[PDB]
Amino acid sequence: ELFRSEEMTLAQLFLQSEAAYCCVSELEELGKVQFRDLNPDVNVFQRKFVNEVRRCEEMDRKLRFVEKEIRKANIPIMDTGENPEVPFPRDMIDLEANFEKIENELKEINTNQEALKRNFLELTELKFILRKTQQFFDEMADPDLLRLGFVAGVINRERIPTFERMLWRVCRGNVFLRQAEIENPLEDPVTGDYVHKSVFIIFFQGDQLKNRVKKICEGFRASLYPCPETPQERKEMASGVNTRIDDLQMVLNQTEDHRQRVLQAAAKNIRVWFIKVRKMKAIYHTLNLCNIDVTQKCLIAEVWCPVTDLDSIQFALRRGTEHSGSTVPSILNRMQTNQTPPTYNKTNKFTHGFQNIVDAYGIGTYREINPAPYTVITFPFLFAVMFGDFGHGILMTLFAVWMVLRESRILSQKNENEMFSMVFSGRYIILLMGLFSIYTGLIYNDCFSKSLNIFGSSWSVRPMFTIGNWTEETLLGSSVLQLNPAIPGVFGGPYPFGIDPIWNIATNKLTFLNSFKMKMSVILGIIHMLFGVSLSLFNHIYFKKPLNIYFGFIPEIIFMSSLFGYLVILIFYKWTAYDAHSSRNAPSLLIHFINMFLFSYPESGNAMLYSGQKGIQCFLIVVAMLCVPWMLLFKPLILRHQYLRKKHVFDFGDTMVHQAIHTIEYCLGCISNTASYLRLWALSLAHAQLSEVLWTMVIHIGLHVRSLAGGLGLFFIFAAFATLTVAILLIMEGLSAFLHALRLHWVEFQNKFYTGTGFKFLPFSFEHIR
Amino acid sequence: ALSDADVQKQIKHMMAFIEQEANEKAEEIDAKAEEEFNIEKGRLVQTQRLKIMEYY
Numbered sequence: 001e002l003f004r005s006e007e008m009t010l011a012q013l014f015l016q017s018e019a020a021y022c023c024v025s026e027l028e029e030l031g032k033v034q035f036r037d038l039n040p041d042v043n044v045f046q047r048k049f050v051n052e053v054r055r056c057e058e059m060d061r062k063l064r065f066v067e068k069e070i071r072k073a074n075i076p077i078m079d080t081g082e083n084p085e086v087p088f089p090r091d092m093i094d095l096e097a098n099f100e101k102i103e104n105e106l107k108e109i110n111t112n113q114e115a116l117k118r119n120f121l122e123l124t125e126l127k128f129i130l131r132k133t134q135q136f137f138d139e140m141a142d143p144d145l146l147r148l149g150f151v152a153g154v155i156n157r158e159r160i161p162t163f164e165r166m167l168w169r170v171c172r173g174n175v176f177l178r179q180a181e182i183e184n185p186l187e188d189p190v191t192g193d194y195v196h197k198s199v200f201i202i203f204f205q206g207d208q209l210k211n212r213v214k215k216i217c218e219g220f221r222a223s224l225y226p227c228p229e230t231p232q233e234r235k236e237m238a239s240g241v242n243t244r245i246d247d248l249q250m251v252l253n254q255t256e257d258h259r260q261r262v263l264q265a266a267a268k269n270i271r272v273w274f275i276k277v278r279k280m281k282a283i284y285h286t287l288n289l290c291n292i293d294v295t296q297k298c299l300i301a302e303v304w305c306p307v308t309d310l311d312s313i314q315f316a317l318r319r320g321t322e323h324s325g326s327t328v329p330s331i332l333n334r335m336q337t338n339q340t341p342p343t344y345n346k347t348n349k350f351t352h353g354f355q356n357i358v359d360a361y362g363i364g365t366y367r368e369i370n371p372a373p374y375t376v377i378t379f380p381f382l383f384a385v386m387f388g389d390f391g392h393g394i395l396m397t398l399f400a401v402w403m404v405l406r407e408s409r410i411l412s413q414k415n416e417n418e419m420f421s422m423v424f425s426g427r428y429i430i431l432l433m434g435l436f437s438i439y440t441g442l443i444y445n446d447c448f449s450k451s452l453n454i455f456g457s458s459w460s461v462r463p464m465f466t467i468g469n470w471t472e473e474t475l476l477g478s479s480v481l482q483l484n485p486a487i488p489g490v491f492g493g494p495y496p497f498g499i500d501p502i503w504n505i506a507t508n509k510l511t512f513l514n515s516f517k518m519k520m521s522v523i524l525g526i527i528h529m530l531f532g533v534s535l536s537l538f539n540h541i542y543f544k545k546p547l548n549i550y551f552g553f554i555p556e557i558i559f560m561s562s563l564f565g566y567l568v569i570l571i572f573y574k575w576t577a578y579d580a581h582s583s584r585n586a587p588s589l590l591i592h593f594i595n596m597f598l599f600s601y602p603e604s605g606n607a608m609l610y611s612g613q614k615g616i617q618c619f620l621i622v623v624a625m626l627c628v629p630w631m632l633l634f635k636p637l638i639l640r641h642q643y644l645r646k647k648h649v650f651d652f653g654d655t656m657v658h659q660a661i662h663t664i665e666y667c668l669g670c671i672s673n674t675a676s677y678l679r680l681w682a683l684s685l686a687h688a689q690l691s692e693v694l695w696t697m698v699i700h701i702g703l704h705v706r707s708l709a710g711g712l713g714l715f716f717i718f719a720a721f722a723t724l725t726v727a728i729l730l731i732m733e734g735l736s737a738f739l740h741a742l743r744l745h746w747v748e749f750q751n752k753f754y755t756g757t758g759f760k761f762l763p764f765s766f767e768h769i770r
Numbered sequence: 771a772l773s774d775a776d777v778q779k780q781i782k783h784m785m786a787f788i789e790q791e792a793n794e795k796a797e798e799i800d801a802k803a804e805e806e807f808n809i810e811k812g813r814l815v816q817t818q819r820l821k822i823m824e825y826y
């Protein structure tokens with residue numbers, strides 16, 4: 001399960017070449033096998049099956065091209081869900097023939113479509129030119145049918161003025177030009193746009209002016225085409241071009257229909273083709289990693305496998321043998337090993353987020369205490385200790401529930417939004433964070449910066465006027481006044497569940513919340529670190545390091561408990577002991593801890609918390625400092641003894657330096673981590689104050705309006721309040737609290753028992769499903 | 771069972787299969803050699819038969 005990584009073991013398979021492909025295909029489907037390169041001497045680009053992998057890559061390129069044409073067209077791509085296996089026999093020839101056809105036909109179709117569209121456009125321009133020239137030659141055509149030179153073409157509209165000016169300026173007053181607009185604008189022969197055009201006819205005298213006008217038009221990027229010289233020729237060639245235009249239109253429609261049909265057929269199965277070719281490529285690239293006939297006709301495979309799945313792998317090999325039809329059976333064999341096994345955690349849908357979260361800071365070593373199962377609660381809980389707010393937690397849990405419910409929809413509809421993909425993958429993390437934030441918001445008695453008062457406050461103001469020394473005169477005279485629980489009836493016990501509501505309206509709020517939350521942060525941090533140290537003991541026991549257990553953990557736990565666990569005990573004891581009547585001489589635990597460390601127990605100032613404090617604290621400090629030599633000197637000396645005096649590389653100086661570094665690191669880390677766990681209080685107070693200021697600066701405006709017209713203003717004011725809460729608080733403050741719970745887990749909690757010097761188990765599982 | 775006995779049996783099966791492959795290759799090459807010998811012998815004997823028939 002998730003308690004620690006799965007039992008991992010090497011294995012080696014002898015499998016005959018004929019059935020090897022099918023067997024590795026079954027392995028790929030199964031997904032619990034990780035191959036390893038066994039021919040690293042020769043680079044990947046020169047192995048046996050590189051020809052096969054190259055051809056597979058070419059097939060993948062063909063499929064990508066056809067798919068790109070599919071996207072270019074409006075045609076959609078189906079999705080059946082079948083995952084057929086690549087055909088081990090030489091079905092590659094058939095697939096290559098199919099894809100070669102589907103690519104060559106499409107390329108020929110595209111080229112012919114382009115050329116025929118160009119020809120159709122040119123011919124339609126010629127048709128329009130002929131029609132307008134016939135129209136121009138209709139003043140009085142008395143004759144039925146050579147010095148004058150003739151040309152005609154088409155120009156872009158609004159270029160008529162410049163072109164006419166250029167003609168009349170070059171062929172000075174010795175060329176004639178007539179123009180006519182072409183309604184129903186046409187598409188450019190090459191430029192490829194719908195632009196208005198003018199068909200124009202030019203008359204000129206001789207060869208020199210012919211050349212002049214021809215070059216002028218060519219520079220003006222017009223087009224000329226030939227033209228008739230007699231009305232009979234005009235009619236003949238006009239009819240010819242009209243018929244050719246109709247024929248070209250028919251051919252264009254037919255070829256476009258052919259393209260549409262072939263592309264629809266391609267899209268019907270493009271996904272299945274992609275999956276087939278991608279697995280085939282993966283399987284051949286995997287077989288590359290296996291030994292080749294340079295050593296034996298039967299393939300040799302080396303693999304990591306969990307112990308429990310060996311029988312399943314053998315059954316998969318049996319399927320491979322049956323499918324391949326080879327009489328000989330492939331054989332698997334275990335073998336005791338020295339190489340480091342990978343870390344495999346058997347991740348689940350709900351535990352995937354937390355496992356990735358704990359893996360980010362380093363994949364756990366082989367079979368060490370996995371922090372994931374405890375993280376599953378302590379990361380949401382530490383997040384809630386900071387983000388604690390009933391309303392914001394409600395919003396977050398509703399959002400996470402929406403993602404969870406509609407997860408199938410979003411999983412199917414994949415997008416490239418990295419942020420949204422991250423959040424969705426963490427949906428369960430966000431859901432638990434929202435739930436625990438709801439709980440901690442109830443404890444804080446906080447809901448959009450406002451408390452609830454569901455049980456009734458323990459603070460009654462009347463005893464102040466009844467027993468106390470107040471009156472309406474004092475209320476008039478004092479701007480803020482204050483309250484005291486010393487007089488009998490003011491403070492009627494603690495609030496049964498969560499912080500008392502009156503603190504919300506008390507200006508003394510921060511004075512009390514600061515201390516309560518600082519103590520809470522320190523307590524939770526120290527207990528988390530102690531749990532980590534216990535987990536470290538578990539690690540040592542499992543790995544059989546009694547040296548670590550007796551020097552290391554036990555000194556570490558004694559040091560931590562004596563110095564900082566005693567602080568938690570002091571906090572709880574002061575809470576339970578000191579009350580309002582003893583307020584005057586209530587000691588400060590900060591000063592008392594400083595004095596504990598400094599041996600500065602004074603005869604003046606705050607008194608001792610309890611009898612025997614001097615002696616007990618001196619004893620605790622002595623034990624704490626003794627734990628430093630305990631860690632430092634002992635383990636190196638025993639190691640040096642039993643590994644250099646017995647049996648006789650060990651370097652005593654380096655071992656001493658390493659142990660000194662470890663002891664300094666751990667001892668300074670205790671202090672710095674107990675300090676850094678104050679980020680819980682810091683972020684909680686920040687979130688609370690930001691929510692309070694947002695409320696009082698946004699919706700206080702809409703609420704503090706006498707006139708009933710304010711109900712309309714509250715509309716927009718609350719729109720702003722909602723957007724601001726979602727942006728500043730839910731998104732950014734929530735992200736900060738999330739990442740700081742992460743940092744706490746990675747450093748403060750996991751430095752006690754985690755190593756994270758393993759390798760992620762990357763199996764030969766087919767994820768080409770994408 | 772994946773015991774040493776099963777591993778030995780599988781290795782023995784692989785050895786038997788490779789022996790069969792070698793034997794089949796040997797049979798094929800032996801048949802090819804026999805046919806080559808026969809055709810070369812026929813060619814040479816025909817070449818000498820030409821001279822014998824011419825003389826007689």
Ligand SMILES: CCCCCCCCCCCCCCCCCC(=O)OC[C@H](COP(=O)([O-])OCC[N+](C)(C)C)OC(=O)CCCCCCCCCCCCCCCCC
Binds near residue numbers: 396
């Ligand atoms: C209406 C609004 C309500 C409030 C909702 C939002 C609350 C605010 C806090 C949300 C923080 C989201 C980040 C945690 C979720 C990702 C963790 C997870 O499970 O994925 C493992 C992630 C991503 O998943 P993955 O791709 O690695 O998945 C594993 C895949 N294999 C195994 C193949 C590799 O893995 C990691 O890399 C782990 C480190 C994660 C550290 C998180 C860094 C911060 C990310 C910030 C997100 C964007 C900010 C918010 C923007 C919002 C606007 C669109």
Ligand SMILES: CCCCCCCCCCCCCCCCCCCC(=O)O[C@H](COC(=O)CCCCCCCCCCCCCC)COP(=O)(O)OCCN
Binds near residue numbers: 348350432436
């Ligand atoms: C608001 C005030 C209270 C706040 C504090 C309590 C917050 C508790 C947060 C946990 C509750 C949500 C758990 C996730 C619900 C979604 C289920 C996801 C899928 C699922 O079933 O997950 C399984 C893991 O176990 C689970 O899903 C775990 C379910 C049982 C957990 C029991 C512990 C609950 C907390 C303690 C009791 C309640 C206290 C508060 C009254 C394994 O995944 P799969 O097999 O479905 O995967 C399928 C593909 N692999």
Ligand SMILES: CCCCCCCCCCCCCCCCCCCC(=O)O[C@H](COC(=O)CCCCCCCCCCCCCC)COP(=O)(O)OCCN
Binds near residue numbers: 530
């Ligand atoms: C994996 C977990 C690791 C451990 C995590 C926990 C942290 C451990 C810290 C070190 C060991 C425990 C703490 C020892 C220091 C003394 C604690 C005193 C607490 C305290 O304030 O109690 C008062 C003093 O008790 C008295 O008056 C009695 C005499 C003084 C205390 C005697 C010793 C008690 C503790 C015994 C050891 C417990 C070990 C726990 C691990 C109550 O007294 P009051 O208010 O009535 O009196 C006052 C008028 N005189």
Ligand SMILES: *[C@@H]1O[C@H](CO)[C@@H](O)[C@H](O)[C@H]1NC(C)=O
Binds near residue numbers: 470
């Ligand atoms: C007068 O005020 C003091 C100070 O709060 C209070 O302790 C005392 O009980 C009052 N005396 C009365 C109401 O007689």
